[PDB]
Design a protein around this ligand. Structure first.
Ligand SMILES: COc1c(CN)cc(CN)cc1OCCCN1Cc2ccccc2C1
Length: 190
């Protein structure tokens, strides 16, 4: 496969209401083929779900088929955006890679929220909203006073090889870490 397909499904946590979601399947993770990375319409993060076993997913359907600036990859950037009150704000981050499947899009993450995001950064650049600044994959990871969180390293960023993507068992975001930085100092690997 469903990589490259558009999908829709219901979502239900506990006894809560069922919500309906539409998205695009970007990736079947090689080190965990149960794990799919998904871009949901209108939501900017990249999500990871083990679709074959996550009981929160219901009524999974495949939707009918729909669908250089590589110099930006690896760059530190300031990404400007419009706020709920009209004022402009910005987050600084790093362009990680071109997104798969949705190839005009780019993977990016930010110091203020170091999870995996996906944006049409060449459009934002043309609009004046992007300022360009001048073997662990497959291993288990844990971080832990008393917070004991488990996951897996799922990808290494080719353009900055100390940077990795991690999928934690307790959440559907994709977490991005530079293993030389303070943000990663409580991550341990096996
Ligand atoms: C506002 O999001 C953007 C949108 C809207 N879909 C669109 C675009 C593309 N023009 C950029 C955005 O922001 C680029 C920085 C990263 N965002 C800043 C932020 C603030 C609060 C909550 C989450 C985020 C993520």
């Amino acid at each position: 496969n469903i990589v490259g397909c558009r999908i829709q499904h219901g979502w239900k946590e506990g006894n809560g209401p069922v919500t309906q979601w539409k998205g695009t399947v970007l990736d079947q993770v090689p080190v965990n083929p149960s794990l799919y990375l998904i871009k949901y319409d209108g939501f900017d993060c990249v999500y990871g779900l083990e679709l074959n076993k996550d009981e929160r997913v219901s009524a999974l359907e495949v939707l009918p088929d729909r669908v250089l600036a590589d110099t930006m990859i690896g760059k530190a950037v300031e990404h400007m955006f419009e706020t709920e009150d009209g004022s402009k704000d910005e987050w600084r981050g790093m362009v990680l890679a071109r997104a798969p499947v949705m190839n005009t899009w780019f993977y990016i993450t930010y110091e203020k929220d170091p999870v995996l995001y996906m944006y049409q950064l060449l459009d934002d650049y043309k609009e004046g909203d992007l300022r360009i600044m001048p073997s662990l994959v497959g291993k288990q990871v844990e971080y832990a006073d008393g917070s004991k969180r488990t996951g897996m390293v799922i990808h290494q960023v080719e353009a900055k090889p100390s940077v990795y993507f991690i999928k934690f068992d307790d959440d559907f975001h994709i977490y991005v870490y530079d293993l030389v930085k303070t943000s990663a100092e409580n991550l341990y690997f096996q």
